[PDB]
Design a protein around this ligand. Structure first.
Ligand code: ZN
Ligand code: ZN
Ligand code: ZN
Lengths: 335, 159, 98, 107, 224, 84
């Protein structure tokens, strides 16, 4: 539609695969490294820093430089950035999912709460529809809170068959804001085992459970092992959107105005910086987890706004907001 | 009832015959009754024909029925059309209704009329369950600025 | 009336006016040109136009790469969907690996 | 083929696949007083050898799942003892083209 | 609601009818590969009448004074009286007509003769009566072979499918069965000589024409 | 997945949708001051002109017909018979 050449064959899109970025992948694809929450100033001298919009990403001021791809502020498929998070954070839009999944797999061994030995469960496993399966399994096994070691065979209920070994009790999970809380107990009101126990299911716990689960288990669920691993519903590596995504408002020369999206990235980068600092220099133990819930907040904030708290900060005293669900909706409702 | 039938001389002859019309149904148990030609027995309940004679029969029935509805208005419509209807309504071995069965689908994709304004939760879920969109729908290709593979766009032009 | 609803859309599909449906239902947002990797449908292709160099890196592709047109909105939509860890793999063939 | 008169013990019914690979079929006498296949609305169903089937899917380049279907419990399929996977060629009359062959794959 | 269920079904280049999933709904559209707008109601004469009128009409017996082609109709009519090798052809023709009469009566039990089929033959003929100014006075310069073998080759060309293999070649035969019945019933030797005195050119023209019209009547891959 | 120039089973004729998309594209180019391969008998309209270039089998375009399986056939505008 524009001009120039391309030894590359012109073609139309026929299929479209939907998946989730693997932590590995985002790093393979990213061209930046992002460390500084700053943007274009180095001792006043205008340019950019090895931090945000600059490294290999596109440019501004009408400069044809950009990952040796040239072209300029136009005809430039903005290139993606990279940025490593300290402790693994959660992805807002999938939290609900994560639960539903945690309530389907036993904690510690990462094995489906119900096997083929269960005849009810067999029916839900024959269903060939992600929505249905994941729905049919969850409602069926969310009930059991004890990872069975043995289950009555297809024959005489007299003999029991050995299966996933770990009769450990399962927790009852309840969502509280941006975290997941669960309760335990040795039976329901059975001698010497009353009263629950409440601890917070961190992100590292969640990772081991989602990483130990085996393919045949994702299968029964809505995952493909190739484009979507449950473990990828939790963020490890933040993919950085290129400058055309978050343009920098400019009137003539010398006048601020960088998109609300670059602001929430400074917060994520800072909420990440103060986190690495602490674990390295002086770790006050459970006094750090408060800068961890901040990153967990700015990563959730930077993607969506619909919680108890609304981060409208920015440069205004008149609180505004623009995540991404907010941007997609405006464009999904415009199209 | 009248009934054009062949004559031994060859010409078709109007050879009238007695037929019983019923107001209630029990196909399974009337075929058996002796004295009747179990071959020609008919019902306007295709659902019962299917259960007793098999889906292919049902298909014929369902057509015979759809036909009469239109015919009864003096109207006429080419076979190919109702036929196609009757087939779609059949290909799965059983009689499938079309007056909206599913609340989600019938034969669409995860993008056409992104309804619910939840193209938000739909995309998140589509990422979770590695969804493979075929892009054969008009509006899905719109979002890609393409023509759908229909009529005019059902083939590529090249140099 | 005067809107172009599902109903007039159907009639146009019957007529088989494929390209008209595109011109109407679409939003004139000037088609954009992007370079896509043929192995992972992401817009991760460095198009060095002057040295015929493309590269996808991470994938190791300097040959399997295509060029496509899409409305600018489309492009942002995708990059945005990428910004949320969602992968809009764009592919150039229906004949899946099946 | 077991032709009962009134009904089978829901227990004796769990004794059908009890001897693979052989197959057991149950037919209620009443269901046989009349041969449905002789009905005026039942086209002729002809089973295809796995070879015939093979050539079928090839020549039309189809996934086994893109063929019209016939239920294993379907009356005509029960009549021919079809098994999930087998394909039937159905030759029917037509007011469009004298003959017209369709195919159905038992499930 | 109906449009929702079938909105994705189209006719593909293999002359098949499938939906967005690629599932086969009709191995040939409308079972005949034809396009409804190129169809018209025509009457298949062969079904109706007494077996007697059927015979006075389509029966030709060169080996028999009475029931042969009066030499007024044909140029080689006098010197054909008795051609053994030609009777074989006529007999094979007449046989085919009878097989058909039986077939049509098994399809349409009504005895009903009027059905929509592509190519209005009745017309093409009147379009030969006054296009070549044919006079029903002089004999035709038509050879009993010209007809019999001409009509027989035509059928090789109608074509709705082209697959070069066993299966498809049958489909092709199927999709065309009813139409040929009409063709054979109309371009039967007596008829083409005793009913509408065509000439080797008018007839050669008609044949040519029917092939064309028939091919324009096939459905175009892409029709939604 | 390609199919040799022989073995092509698809129709020898040009479908209306094909003859409709060709005239379209071609007409477009002509409207964009593109090289014309025909001798105008004094015709001004691009579509009008494309119909003539189609009429004189002078259109270097090729139609790639996709089967539903994925394979395809390539037919050059030139071959395709243009009745309609
Ligand atoms: Zn660039
Ligand atoms: Zn466990
Ligand atoms: Zn790549």
């Amino acid at each position: 539609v524009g001009q120039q050449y391309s030894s590359a064959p012109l073609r139309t899109v026929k299929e479209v695969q939907f998946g989730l970025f693997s932590p590995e992948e985002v790093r393979a694809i990213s061209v930046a490294k992002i460390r500084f929450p700053e943007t274009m100033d180095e001792t006043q001298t205008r340019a950019k820093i090895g931090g945000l919009n600059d490294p290999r990403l596109g440019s501004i001021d009408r400069n044809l430089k950009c990952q040796t791809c040239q072209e300029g502020m136009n005809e430039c498929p903005g290139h993606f950035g990279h940025i490593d998070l300290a402790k693994p954070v959660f992805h807002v839009g999938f939290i609900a999912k994560i639960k539903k999944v945690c309530e389907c797999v036993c904690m510690h061994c990462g094995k489906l709460l119900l096997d083929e030995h269960n005849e009810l469960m067999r029916q839900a496993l024959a269903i060939k529809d992600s929505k249905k399966r994941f729905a049919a399994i969850w409602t069926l096994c969310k009930t059991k809170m004890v990872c069975e070691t043995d289950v009555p065979s297809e024959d005489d209920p007299t003999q029991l068959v050995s299966r996933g070994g770990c009769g450990n009790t399962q927790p009852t999970i309840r969502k509280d804001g941006l975290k997941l809380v669960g309760s335990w107990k040795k039976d329901r009101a059975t001698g010497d085992a009353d009263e629950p126990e409440l601890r917070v299911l961190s992100t590292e716990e969640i990772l081991n459970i989602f990483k130990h689960i085996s393919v045949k288990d994702f299968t029964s669920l809505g995952f493909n092992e190739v484009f979507s691993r449950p473990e990828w519903m939790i963020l490890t590596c933040l993919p950085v959107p290129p400058p055309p995504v978050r343009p920098s408002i400019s009137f003539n020369e010398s006048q601020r105005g960088e998109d609300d999206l670059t602001f929430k990235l400074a917060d994520i980068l800072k909420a990440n910086i103060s986190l690495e600092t602490l674990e390295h220099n002086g770790a006050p133990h459970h006094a750090i987890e408060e800068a961890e819930s901040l990153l967990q907040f700015h990563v959730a904030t930077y993607m969506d706004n619909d919680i108890a708290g609304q981060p409208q900060a920015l440069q205004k005293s008149g609180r505004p907001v623009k995540s991404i669900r907010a941007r997609l909706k405006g464009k999904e409702g415009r199209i | 009832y009248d009934r054009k039938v062949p004559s031994p001389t060859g010409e078709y002859v109007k050879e009238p015959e007695w037929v019983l019309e019923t107001d209630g149904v029990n196909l399974s148990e009337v075929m058996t009754v002796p004295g009747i030609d179990p071959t020609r027995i008919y019902t306007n309940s295709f659902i019962d024909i299917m259960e007793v004679l098999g889906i292919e029969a049902g298909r014929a029935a369902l057509y015979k029925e759809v036909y009469n509805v239109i015919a009864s208005d003096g109207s006429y419509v080419n076979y190919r059309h109702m036929a196609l209807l009757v087939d779609v309504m059949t290909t799965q071995g059983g009689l499938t209704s079309v007056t909206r069965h599913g609340f989600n689908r019938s034969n669409t994709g995860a993008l056409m009329r992104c309804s619910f304004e939840e193209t938000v939760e739909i995309l998140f879920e589509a990422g979770a369950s590695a969804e493979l969109d075929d892009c054969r729908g008009v509006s899905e290709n719109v979002i890609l600025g393409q023509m759908a593979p229909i009529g005019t766009g059902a083939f590529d032009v090249m140099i | 009336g005067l809107r172009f609803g599902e109903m007039e859309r159907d009639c146009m599909i019957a007529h088989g006016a494929a390209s008209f449906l595109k011109e109407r239902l679409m939003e004139a947002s000037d088609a954009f040109r992007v370079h896509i990797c043929g192995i992972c449908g992401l817009m991760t292709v460095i198009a060095k136009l002057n040295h015929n160099q493309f590269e996808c890196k991470g994938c190791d592709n300097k040959i399997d790469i295509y060029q496509i047109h899409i409305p600018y909105a489309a492009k942002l939509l995708f990059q945005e969907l990428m910004a949320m860890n969602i992968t809009p793999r764009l592919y150039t063939d229906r004949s899946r690996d099946f | 083929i077991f032709v009962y008169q009134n009904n089978i013990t829901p227990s004796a019914m769990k004794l059908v696949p009890s001897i693979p690979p052989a197959t057991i079929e149950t037919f209620n006498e009443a269901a046989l007083v009349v041969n449905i296949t002789h009905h005026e609305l039942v086209p002729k169903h002809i089973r295809l050898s796995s070879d015939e089937k093979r050539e079928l899917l090839k020549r039309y380049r189809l996934k086994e799942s893109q063929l019209p279907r016939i239920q294993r419990a379907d009356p005509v399929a029960l009549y021919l003892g079809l098994k999930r996977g087998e394909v039937v060629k159905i030759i029917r009359k037509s007011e469009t083209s004298g003959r017209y062959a369709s195919y159905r794959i038992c499930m | 609601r109906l449009v929702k269920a079938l909105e994705d079904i189209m006719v593909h280049y293999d002359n098949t009818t499938r939906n967005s999933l690629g599932n086969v709904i009709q191995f040939i559209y409308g079972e005949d590969g034809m396009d409804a707008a190129h169809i018209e109601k025509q009457s298949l004469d062969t079904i109706g009448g007494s077996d007697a009128a059927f015979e006075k009409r389509y029966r030709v017996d060169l080996l028999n004074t009475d029931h042969t082609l009066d030499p007024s109709l044909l140029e080689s009519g006098s010197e054909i009286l008795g051609d053994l090798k030609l009777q074989v052809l006529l007999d094979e023709e007449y046989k085919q007509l009878v097989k058909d009469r039986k077939f049509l009566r098994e399809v349409f039990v009504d005895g009903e003769a009027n059905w929509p089929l592509p190519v209005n033959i009745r017309r093409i003929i009147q379009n030969a009566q006054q296009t070549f100014h044919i006079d029903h006075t002089k004999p035709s310069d038509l050879t009993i072979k010209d007809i019999v073998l001409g009509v027989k080759d035509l059928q090789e060309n109608l074509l709705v499918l082209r697959g070069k293999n066993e299966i498809i070649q049958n489909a092709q035969r199927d999709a065309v069965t009813l139409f040929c019945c009409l063709l054979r019933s109309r371009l039967a030797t007596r008829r083409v000589l005793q009913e509408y005195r065509l000439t080797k050119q008018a007839f050669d023209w008609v044949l040519s024409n029917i092939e064309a019209q028939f091919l324009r009547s096939v459905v175009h891959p892409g029709e939604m | 997945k390609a199919i040799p120039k022989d073995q092509r089973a698809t129709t020898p004729y040009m479908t209306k949708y094909e003859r409709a998309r060709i005239l379209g594209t071609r007409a477009l180019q002509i409207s964009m001051n593109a090289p014309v391969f025909v001798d105008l008998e004094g015709e001004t309209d691009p579509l009008r002109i494309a119909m003539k270039e189609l009429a004189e089998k002078k259109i270097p375009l090729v139609i790639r017909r996709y089967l539903p399986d994925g394979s395809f056939e390539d037919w050059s505008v030139e071959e395709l018979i243009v009745d309609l």
